Structure formats: structure tokens, C-alpha cells
Amino acid sequence: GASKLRAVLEKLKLSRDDISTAAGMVKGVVDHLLLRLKCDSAFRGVGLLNTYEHVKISAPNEFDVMFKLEVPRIQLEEYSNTRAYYFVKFENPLSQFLEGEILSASKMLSKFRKIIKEEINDIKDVIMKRKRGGSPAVTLLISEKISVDITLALESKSSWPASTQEGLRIQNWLSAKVRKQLRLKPFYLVPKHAFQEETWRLSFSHIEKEILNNHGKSKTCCENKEEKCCRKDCLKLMKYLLEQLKERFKDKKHLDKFSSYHVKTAFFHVCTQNPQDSQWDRKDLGLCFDNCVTYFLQCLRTEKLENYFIPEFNLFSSNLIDKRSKEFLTKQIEYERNNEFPVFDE
Ligand SMILES: Cc1ccc(-c2cc(C(=O)O)c3[nH]c(CN4CCN(Cc5ccccc5)CC4)nc3c2)c(Cl)c1
Ligand SMILES: [Cl-]
Ligand SMILES: [Cl-]
Ligand SMILES: [Zn+2]
């Protein structure tokens, strides 16, 4: 356990908890985008995932929202054996975007971006960055400080695809009972490329809060004085470490492909490796964070970081992230752990 890590955790907490009108500005903007969307024939059934979210743990002005469409009786077809990327096949409100049997993501996104750019001019009471990529579909910069990512997703209440059968390896930590209840939850499909095909990536981002709010082997983890763990604190420090390193080397392109998603995936693999609440005592914060730092470094060094839900999907493969980029991050983190983390300064 370190007083530096603890002081950083206290700073992050005060930044997160203090009075901000930001979420209110975003809510206004989102509720009017959603209203103008429900007027359109194809986007009539659109809704916010949860009735907001943040990618970066340090920046309270950067937001992350999902607009979802329930797609009952969905037919999925795995693209090029990618395990995570699928064609969407099936009258219903989404027949307008069809090309034969396959549902077009590019055409759906073109209409989505069109209606938002139009509503950006409507709200005179917000600069839209039409940055290429399906997920997030759009990034708004409300005023000169606030940033909002909007993702369009399809929701399916059918059993999770076969590629997930060995994923969510939580049975020795959270129990097979919990693994089974979670697998009954829906799954999402976001427009993404594995670069010119009508493919959708499987998303289980909604499962994170479910586990983070009930993360112990003990049902009483963090519910009392004698059972306070450092799992969330470790996850927060891992995320801040990457954010600060990305900010430190933003002028070069070497850390552009790394995201908090990679940090989260590696952190949850350490949760599977260390299932006992005793392997996460709050007093051992320093050691636990280091087991997290060591595991992520091993991931980069071996070019192996499995999608937590799709074991055959390597987030760190040479085809997704180059060796040079991973070695650059490996060197940067090694310098941070061998200089008392200079990013955690103040
Ligand atoms: C145990 C466990 C559980 C869950 C995950 C998980 C899985 C996935 C995944 O895609 O399967 C993730 N994806 C991202 C990044 N996204 C960026 C875009 N945001 C849009 C949004 C905005 C608002 C509301 C919904 C959606 C959501 C967060 N974190 C993810 C985390 C992991 Cl690793 C382990
Ligand atoms: Cl925080
Ligand atoms: Cl992310
Ligand atoms: Zn706990």
C-alpha cells in the first residue's frame, strides 16, 4: 500500500464527486437528440441504454452514451472467422437499411450522423465532430470544455453467440450461479470494422457495472470494516496510468490504439487469477496495483490480451496493434514503475 496511490485516489474521488453542471448540459442535448430521433421511421424505437457513463476516469467533462435499438428475431453470421464481428440478417422498422439479407451499418450511421448534425443547428440554446468510425458514431463538443461520445447499438435478448461459450471465466470468483444469471442478460452489436464491410462487433460493456457493484467472492465484500477490498481502487489507478501516459505522449502516435478497454480487460483477467478477497486487501493496495501493472506488461510483451467474453479474440494481436506500439508502452510503464509513477505527482 502507498500514500501516493491513496492521495491520487482521493484527488480522483474529489474531482468525480464535486458539483458540476456538465451532466445537465449533456442531458439537455441528449434528450433533444433522442426526441428528434423518435420522429424518424428507422430510429423510432431508439432509447438510452440506462435511464451518464465516462471512458476517462480523470476528465469529468468527457462523457459516453449509448442509443440502442431492440432487434428481435435477429439472425447473425460471423464474418471472416473473427469471432467478434458479424453480419446482421433477418415488415420491421429496419428494412430500409437492408442490402439483400444483410443490414447495412454505414447507411444506418449516415442517417444517424445526418439527424444529429441537423439537431446541432436546431438547438440555439455544441460543435459536432464527424470523426470517422462507427463506434463511437459521433463526438460532440458542447461549448469549449464538454465532450460527448454517442454510440448506436443493436440489442438482442437471445442467448449469447457460440464464441462467448468459454468467456466470462468468473465461476471460481463470482460463482457459476452468477455466471449463469449474467449470461441471461442481453447483448449488444455496435457498427465496427475488424475496412469496407457491413459488420457489427459484439459488445458486453453493460456487464461491467453488474460485476463492479458485486465484485467479491464474499457476498459482503466492501459491505463492512473487516471486508474492504482494493479491486475498484486498482482498476482506477490502472486507468489513470494509461490516461496520463496517453496525455504524456499524445504528440507521437504510439499510444493512439490503447484505450481504458484494454486496461479493464487485463484488470478483470487479474480478478479471475486472484479470486479470493484476501488477494485484494485494502492494506495491500501497493502490491495489488503492482500485480495489475505486471500482468498488463506481460500482456504487451507477449502480444496477448484476450477479450474477456470472446477468448479467441486477441485485442493485442500484431494485426490490431503493431509490435513497435506495444514495446513503446512496455518501456513507458516500466519507467513509471521504476520512478515511483511520475504521472501520479501533484
Ligand atoms: C467483467 C467485464 C465486464 C465488461 C467488460 C467490458 C466489455 C466491453 C465490450 O465491448 O464487450 C467494453 N467496451 C468498453 C468501452 N466502451 C466504450 C463505449 N461505451 C459506450 C456506452 C456508453 C454508455 C452506455 C453503454 C455503452 C461503452 C464502453 N468497455 C468495456 C468493458 C469487461 Cl472488459 C469485463
Ligand atoms: Cl473516480
Ligand atoms: Cl475505451
Ligand atoms: Zn470489495
mmCIF file of all heavy atoms in Angstrom, residues 12-13 16 57 236, ligand 2:
data_model
loop_
_atom_site.group_PDB
_atom_site.id
_atom_site.type_symbol
_atom_site.label_atom_id
_atom_site.label_comp_id
_atom_site.label_asym_id
_atom_site.label_seq_id
_atom_site.Cartn_x
_atom_site.Cartn_y
_atom_site.Cartn_z
ATOM 1 N N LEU A 12 -8.909 11.917 -7.480
ATOM 2 C CA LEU A 12 -9.871 11.386 -8.449
ATOM 3 C C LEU A 12 -11.299 11.426 -7.884
ATOM 4 O O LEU A 12 -12.201 11.903 -8.567
ATOM 5 C CB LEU A 12 -9.510 9.939 -8.870
ATOM 6 C CG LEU A 12 -8.234 9.679 -9.714
ATOM 7 C CD1 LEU A 12 -8.072 8.182 -9.965
ATOM 8 C CD2 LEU A 12 -8.278 10.397 -11.068
ATOM 9 N N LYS A 13 -11.484 10.970 -6.628
ATOM 10 C CA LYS A 13 -12.767 10.975 -5.912
ATOM 11 C C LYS A 13 -13.337 12.408 -5.718
ATOM 12 O O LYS A 13 -14.523 12.628 -5.967
ATOM 13 C CB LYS A 13 -12.631 10.240 -4.568
ATOM 14 C CG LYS A 13 -13.936 10.018 -3.828
ATOM 15 C CD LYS A 13 -13.671 9.694 -2.366
ATOM 16 C CE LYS A 13 -14.850 10.028 -1.489
ATOM 17 N NZ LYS A 13 -14.524 9.855 -0.048
ATOM 18 N N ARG A 16 -14.469 13.699 -9.179
ATOM 19 C CA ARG A 16 -15.678 12.967 -9.547
ATOM 20 C C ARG A 16 -16.914 13.480 -8.769
ATOM 21 O O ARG A 16 -17.900 13.853 -9.400
ATOM 22 C CB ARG A 16 -15.446 11.452 -9.335
ATOM 23 C CG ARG A 16 -16.655 10.564 -9.605
ATOM 24 C CD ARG A 16 -16.466 9.159 -9.065
ATOM 25 N NE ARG A 16 -17.755 8.508 -8.812
ATOM 26 C CZ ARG A 16 -17.956 7.192 -8.809
ATOM 27 N NH1 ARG A 16 -16.952 6.357 -9.056
ATOM 28 N NH2 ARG A 16 -19.164 6.702 -8.571
ATOM 29 N N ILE A 57 -11.311 8.358 -16.544
ATOM 30 C CA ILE A 57 -11.531 8.465 -15.098
ATOM 31 C C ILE A 57 -11.051 9.841 -14.523
ATOM 32 O O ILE A 57 -11.543 10.278 -13.474
ATOM 33 C CB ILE A 57 -10.902 7.214 -14.378
ATOM 34 C CG1 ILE A 57 -11.578 6.907 -13.019
ATOM 35 C CG2 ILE A 57 -9.376 7.267 -14.238
ATOM 36 C CD1 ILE A 57 -12.758 5.859 -13.096
ATOM 37 N N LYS A 236 -9.113 1.818 -11.039
ATOM 38 C CA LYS A 236 -8.994 3.281 -11.190
ATOM 39 C C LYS A 236 -7.554 3.761 -11.473
ATOM 40 O O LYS A 236 -7.367 4.585 -12.361
ATOM 41 C CB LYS A 236 -9.582 4.011 -9.969
ATOM 42 C CG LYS A 236 -11.103 4.004 -9.943
ATOM 43 C CD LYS A 236 -11.622 4.565 -8.623
ATOM 44 C CE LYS A 236 -13.052 4.122 -8.365
ATOM 45 N NZ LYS A 236 -13.287 3.957 -6.903
HETATM 46 CL CL CL B 2 -13.008 8.222 -9.910
#
